[PDB]
From a paper:
The [name] ([name]) is a receptor tyrosine kinase that couples the binding of extracellular ligands, such as [name] and transforming growth factor-α (TGF-α), to the initiation of intracellular signaling pathways. The extracellular module of [name] consists of four domains, denoted Domains I, II, III, and IV. Domain II, which bridges the ligand-binding domains, contains the ‘dimerization arm’, a loop that mediates the principal interaction with the other subunit in an activated dimer. Domains I, II, and III form a compact unit that we refer to as the ligand-binding ‘head’, and Domain IV forms a rigid and elongated ‘leg’ that connects the ligand-binding head to the single transmembrane helix.
To test this hypothesis, we examined an oncogenic variant of [name] seen frequently in cancer patients, in which a leucine residue in the activation loop of the intracellular kinase domain is substituted by arginine ([name]; this is residue 858 when the signal sequence is included). The activation loop is a key allosteric control element at the active site of the kinase domain, and the [name] mutation promotes the formation of the catalytically active asymmetric dimer of the kinase domains, leading to hyper-activation of [name]. We carried out cryo-EM analysis of full-length [name]([name]) bound to [name], using the same procedures as for wild-type [name]. The two structures representing the tips-juxtaposed and the tips-separated conformations of the [name]([name]):[name] complex were determined at resolution of 3.3 Å and 3.4 Å, respectively. The overall structures of the tips-juxtaposed and tips-separated conformations of the [name]([name]):[name] complex are very similar to those seen for the corresponding complex of the wild-type receptor. When the rotational angle between the two heads is at its largest value (~25o), the two legs adopt similar conformations, and the membrane-proximal tips of the two legs are juxtaposed, with a separation of ~5 Å between the Cαatoms of the last residue in the legs (Thr 614) (the ‘juxtaposed’ conformation). The effect of the activating mutation, [name], becomes apparent when comparing the quality of the cryo-EM densities in the Domain IV legs for the wild-type and mutant [name]. For the tips-juxtaposed conformations, the cryo-EM densities are of comparable quality. Cryo-EM densities for the Domain IV legs in the juxtaposed conformation is similarly defined in all three complexes ([name](WT):TGF-α, [name](WT):[name], and [name]([name]):[name]).
Author numbering:
A (entry chain B), B (entry chain A): 1 to 614
C (entry chain D), D (entry chain C): 5 to 51
Write the structure that this text describes.
Amino acid sequence: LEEKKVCQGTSNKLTQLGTFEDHFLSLQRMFNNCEVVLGNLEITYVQRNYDLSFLKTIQEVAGYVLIALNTVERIPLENLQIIRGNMYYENSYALAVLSNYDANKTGLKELPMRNLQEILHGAVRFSNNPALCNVESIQWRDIVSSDFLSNMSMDFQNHLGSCQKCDPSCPNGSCWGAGEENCQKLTKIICAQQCSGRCRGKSPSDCCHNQCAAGCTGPRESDCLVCRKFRNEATCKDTCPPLMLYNPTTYQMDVNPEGKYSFGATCVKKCPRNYVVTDHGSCVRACGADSYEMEEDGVRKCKKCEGPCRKVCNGIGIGEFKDSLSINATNIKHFKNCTSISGDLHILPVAFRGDSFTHTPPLDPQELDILKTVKEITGFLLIQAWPENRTDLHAFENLEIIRGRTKQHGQFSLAVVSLNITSLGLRSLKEISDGDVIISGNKNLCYANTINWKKLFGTSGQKTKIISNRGENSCKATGQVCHALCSPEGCWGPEPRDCVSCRNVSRGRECVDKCNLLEGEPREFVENSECIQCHPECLPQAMNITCTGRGPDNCIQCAHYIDGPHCVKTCPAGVMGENNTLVWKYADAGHVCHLCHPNCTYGCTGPGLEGCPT
Amino acid sequence: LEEKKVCQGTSNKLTQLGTFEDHFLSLQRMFNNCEVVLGNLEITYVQRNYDLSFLKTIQEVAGYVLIALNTVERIPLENLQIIRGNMYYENSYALAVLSNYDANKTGLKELPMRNLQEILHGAVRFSNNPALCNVESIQWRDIVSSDFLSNMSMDFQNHLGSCQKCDPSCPNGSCWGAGEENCQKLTKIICAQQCSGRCRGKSPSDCCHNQCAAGCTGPRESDCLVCRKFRNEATCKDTCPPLMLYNPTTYQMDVNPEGKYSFGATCVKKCPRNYVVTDHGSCVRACGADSYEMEEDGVRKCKKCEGPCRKVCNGIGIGEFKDSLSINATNIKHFKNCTSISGDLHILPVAFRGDSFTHTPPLDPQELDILKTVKEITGFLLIQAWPENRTDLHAFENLEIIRGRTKQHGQFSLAVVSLNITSLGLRSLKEISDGDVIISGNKNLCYANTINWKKLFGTSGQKTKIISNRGENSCKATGQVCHALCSPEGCWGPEPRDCVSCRNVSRGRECVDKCNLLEGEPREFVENSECIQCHPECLPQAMNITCTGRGPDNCIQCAHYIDGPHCVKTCPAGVMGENNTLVWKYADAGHVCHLCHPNCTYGCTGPGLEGCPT
Amino acid sequence: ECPLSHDGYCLHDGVCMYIEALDKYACNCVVGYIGERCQYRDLKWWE
Amino acid sequence: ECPLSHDGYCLHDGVCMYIEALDKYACNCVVGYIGERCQYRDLKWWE
């Protein structure tokens, strides 16, 4: 059973989404049948008499837990085991129960988290709950790490007291609520020094493994409740097994028959096809500045730089761009000569009308042309606004790959929702290596329903939501349909250059009805359905074809002279040779090029000395 | 103290090294005061009344243990704790006690290895011991690994009945010798169910760490008696701490502040000076095929191949030359175009006569010239025979570096013993990165003690042993001393080209007293004491410097023509200039060449255009 | 409600609201948009 | 004593010998030389 229903968790912090009944519905639709929250769990503005029972399934929050401004009288989190805390609230805490009361001082009353065993990182804040009961008696030093216990801030002010004490079969208090089942079970401050981590009792025969996070059911690494750092698919490892093992006997590096790549917090057999496989053995999103990606036998890798490295262009939401939430006119200058945006790309409607809260000027719609040199995006592309003047995504006409290593909402890797464009115009897009694609809500946009997106997707299980665009019959009846000479596979626009693949052949970036064989102005040949011009020194054949390749070596007949295998315009007269000896040739009867006489220094118009006079 | 005395150990399996009392001294001179054996341990052929009390200090054998053909009544291995079985006797065993009986059915009687508690690999064997007491009762499934137990071949025959019963306090009546302390301490087949490795008792609060090999005192990882794989200088891990750790959140690598380089069975702060440093953080001896070694910032590393990797050469005793013991006439071709012997070079007297045992023909002395292309040796150089006609080590006239990674007898790196050479002649040797140097027994070899070897050594601690060569009185008498045209720095022979240095000037490789700037061979000029000839057309004089540089811009005068800065035998007639403009020069009384009017491109014999004849 | 500094703080036609208990400011995102300051569209549960 | 198969098997003038108990052959190296078949000189303890 190596699967647990995961969700993404909210990051609104304090934000109310609509009304008191539209927020709850949006809360319910995310934390439903979820077992492992991959993000942050936030429970805000839950008015009285609402069934919050669906939270009895969450077993591990990988971020912080914020419970603020609620009024429901009972929040059942009876199966939460660990609050790891990879991101703090108020940049210090991991669990926080802030002002949580109704008008007449009533409000949140019980919070039975009786399975909460460890907060890996962070502190706790309990302020301004006047109706809370029994949570004032817990021993938070069994949960929080002693490294963080100096930051905690508890403030219990239940001036009502209309709630019973807890069963005497509980450690001097330490009760999460009412009854004998809802007290607290301690696993860190009872057992003896022989244990290095946590335990199951007081005997030294109970110490759990080092890598058990909450508790354990057995002394070995395959019995931890929740793993602490990694997970080797049945055990709580500390580092994924290396791919190569040192040999103390021969001073060399062997191979490991149980080596595995580290991907996130799991040890997998092989990396995902859209990640960078480092040499140590690890799936990463992008490797250090000393290297650069390199396609190799299908998988991605990166080798050391060749002298000076290239421009590493961070994307919105990584590195120096973590406070910026758009492509605002301040930071647009940094994407000046980029080719691969190693991150995301957001284009929000607050970049064009200007933000005041962060003192940024409006973005001139002409300043988007800086992106026309971007070719890869190792993430997602979220376009949420485009200048009303334009009619297609012109600044991305050179985009070629969207790796989808990090995705919007953890699901999508392309979002073109609610623009005013007529056609997409991404005519150079060839692959979306992961993540769904949503192109919907656009007022007057078609040509999007023709492309067979099952080709671009490079992973099984990719969907596409394309709804509420310009009607199918609405623009079909107005000539707005894919062009004539294009394969029915689709098109990104009406112009012949906008179609992916052609009906017959192509002249570079444009499709055509037939190559210029026999006739035409430039002679051409056909390979892989492409029309390439014959070397200029190919005599225009009005009968059959003209050439069978690019080079003058395939010319059926040379137009001027012929220097051996090649078709030349004029026989060589000054070309470097062996022993620093120059080279001079002449054209005989059949316009064939033959070498001069060893003595002829000023060249020769004929064979030997009888050819070059004074 | 902190570090324990190591010894190298025998391996001459059943060979007797001379007389009964010449073999014992060899046994004594090797294992006296030793505490950790880095190899094997042969105790063969010890007659009785030979006090073997110097063995009570050995605490760990890193190979096998062979006790065969003795007659001594007691072998005091009372402190051996672990046999790491890194190589096997008879390809199956790591402890063999064979045929230890005398002629009249007497022989070995006491083998009190009461502290032996782990044999990490290989089986045991106990045959033909009709005098051994009390060892017929040990429980060999507490010591041998549970995997290697199908190979044990242990039979005891002690019909004499003169053995001893042992104290009742021994587990299941199993003792190592007559006494109360010789009870076998059990640590594996009495472990509680919870224990993974060893246990200091039966209660489940006693299990030792996973890495403890023999036993432990405490459940920590710094309490093991002897360790299993590595040793991090106060504890012992499974693998040396990685140099760069992974990150489950950012999906990137982080610099591990507690990283260590693995070097053998230890974790060191930095690799040794002459060891290749892989990116894994591990000191190796020669890195894999896909890479090629290269220096980088003082320390030796190895980067990926530019493509197909160059000719890699193995040395004797490794690779496919595992059992070949010299440079046979059969494996001499495999060194055809080598430039780095990854391994080591042995030259034994069997090579030049040919052994009919391994069906090897006699070598031809003139076939040694194949080695003239070797420019380094990453191991050691053992020269033990050499053709008689020769006078110097002629095949090694280009050797430059001996790395001394693997060494002979664990100590020596260069060895030229018992030849008939007259002078070494390693005139290009400039480095011995490790190991000592022994040049002795060469009956007539002068110049051996004129070098200052401390400039070749690249480490502190390297000694040197030159003895019993030709005495430095018959060298001076006959006149066998190096050229007076050298410096007191050193000399590899009598010719001027045999000195590590030159007192005045060095004409390339040899030494001369003066670079001729006044007469003789084409003039030269000193720079860092060399002599570099003038440009061919510079005219010499019985006067001041002819030229102070290589280029023709430095001849004081040239007896041929000149174009301003540079002299030319005949000023150019077609050299490429700027914008196809060929330069046209002609004769002049001032000897300087001027530009004609190119309007008659046939070369001008006079100024303007009337000069080109018609 | 919110001071003149916190003006244009809420992006998608949301209204800035001031919390007097925690003494902080928060948004009131219209139905459809999510995020700290109503910056993102909810792609999963509408077009 | 050693059969014709094992001739010249001992390198440095050491006399081959046959061990009856173990049915194997071995050397009797002269003093100064070590190794399985008396191949190496003892560099450590003499010239």
